[PDB]
Amino acid sequence: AATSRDALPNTEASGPTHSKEIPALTAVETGATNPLVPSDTVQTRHVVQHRSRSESSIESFFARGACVTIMTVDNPASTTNKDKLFAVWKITYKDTVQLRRKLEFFTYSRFDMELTFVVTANFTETNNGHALNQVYQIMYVPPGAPVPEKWDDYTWQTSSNPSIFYTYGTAPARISVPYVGISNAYSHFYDGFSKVPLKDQSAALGDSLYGAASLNDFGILAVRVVNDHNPTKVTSKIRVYLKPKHIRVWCPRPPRAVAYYGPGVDYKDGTLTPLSTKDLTTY
Amino acid sequence: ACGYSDRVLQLTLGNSTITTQEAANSVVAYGRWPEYLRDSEANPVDQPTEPDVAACRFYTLDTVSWTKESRGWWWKLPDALRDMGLFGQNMYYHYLGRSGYTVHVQCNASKFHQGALGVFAVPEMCLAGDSNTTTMHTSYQNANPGEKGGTFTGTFTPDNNQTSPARRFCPVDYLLGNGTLLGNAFVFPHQIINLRTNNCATLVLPYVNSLSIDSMVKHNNWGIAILPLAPLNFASESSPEIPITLTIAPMCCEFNGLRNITLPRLQ
């Protein structure tokens, strides 16, 4: 019955003592942290506490969106040699770092994801030609569905794939997706593999990546400029922001201390130096 | 009144009993006792395999040695029990399964010996690899050493053999082999075998995963990390040694999807 925004217990008055009750002395080897308050070691006063842990609840700690990726698409001229650029991006929280580490304070989590889509666009060729406001379609291609090969193939028809139609110059695009995990919670660390290499099988036939599984395959996001070829090329970037609302977490882990190196837990040489210099006898 | 103490303990699982006189109580991970899979939480339809005493008893691994230059030691579960009597057999023949464990590490010395050992149970102890060229590159064989387990190192060594890479872990001790300061390791259920006080560490771990049951052959749910927090010294000698031993016992052992024998390539 203790809510997140409720006041923490008041610190009460305590005078002098001298007996056989031992608050100060314990043993950490047992694995238990001594749950002491100030009155156990010092003489304190009656104090009506007012502060609350309202701002540190799991909900509140993650109550923010974070740039997860930056996608790049364009609309060049018809006379072009290289094909119009369409972006494909696999849905992961692990391309960026900030959000990842927060998520990584825990081993498992349940949340409904809210995604926002900020879109930028610019001219690239130093000309004086013109472009007409663009519309961008962000289709969600789940694992299994056909992933576009052309900016103009049959996939972009979207009969069952969720797709967003964003007009440039308006409110950034935002959708919601429920807990879509194949497991009962999203796993942030997997201590295993996908395949089991068997004795009577070729090593090649039995290999898989360490810590890699379907637990994390959510398909890709495909985007293009709906507009047809324009005489003067226009570049555009869609910045995606993920907010894990309605969140639940399990098993606390120490936070990443060394800069990340790939989607795994691996680290590289010369990055393994997080702490600076500080002498033992100085403040 | 009767002299009952938290240092003196005896635990019994099956036809095996552990006894000690220098304990520091006992830890039950996250306050949860191991349990059987509930109907409300179940998923595979087939009637499950509950081996009981058959698999659920204490199992002693191969003893290792603690000296001044040891950097640490590690093991994974179930992995570290893969070849232990019935449990292992029951593991190799069923597609899925779940289990808890009571891990008991042993290491006594003298009132003249000193040192502290951090015994940490890390759910999903995904260790770091040895290559700076390719990530998540450690092979199954090297990942799962089984009962012998593995060790931590004090210096990162990137494999530069691009022809036939080593494909193993290179777990740096201070980063608890995962890229996170060992100092925070205490966030995980743990105990400290500080020679002065205690000779053992006992931790009870329930089954922990993102799902009710999983393929124990493909996935390790808990890791066992033991690192000397304080160094091992005795009197005034230069190279002292004290053995460390781990006995592990599954708890509430159950398995489903019985089929033919799994013969994995371990080497």
Epitope: A212, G264 | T134
Partner: nanobody, 128 residues
Framework: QVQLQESGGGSVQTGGSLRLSCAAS????????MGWFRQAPGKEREGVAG????????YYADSVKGRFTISQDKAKNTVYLQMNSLKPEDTAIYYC?????????????????????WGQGTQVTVSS
Amino acid sequence: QVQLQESGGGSVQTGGSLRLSCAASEYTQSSACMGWFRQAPGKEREGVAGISRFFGTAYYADSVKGRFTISQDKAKNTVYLQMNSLKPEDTAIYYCAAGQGCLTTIQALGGAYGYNAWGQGTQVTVSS
């Protein structure tokens, strides 16, 4: 699966050009870097070439760089492999390799590990 169907078994002499192709028409989580593996009956199976599904991440085995190149048709869907200046040391059975979720060939970059759909096999002999 995807479709993987390969051909091109021409026993050319030492120093000739050969082209290998593998179908990848259906679009599953499509062959990322793709993959080309040769099995020398003296040795075993080994990875060789590979260009990312969309991106220009093409990895080349130490033994084949420059001479062997990978490229495909992002439409006609088939994967080409230009193998020129052929040594007699490259006489082996080649195979194409679908590495699905692109990250499979981004993490490890090279194939082998993230590869689920296996090709048929074409015998290439480069002799005197």
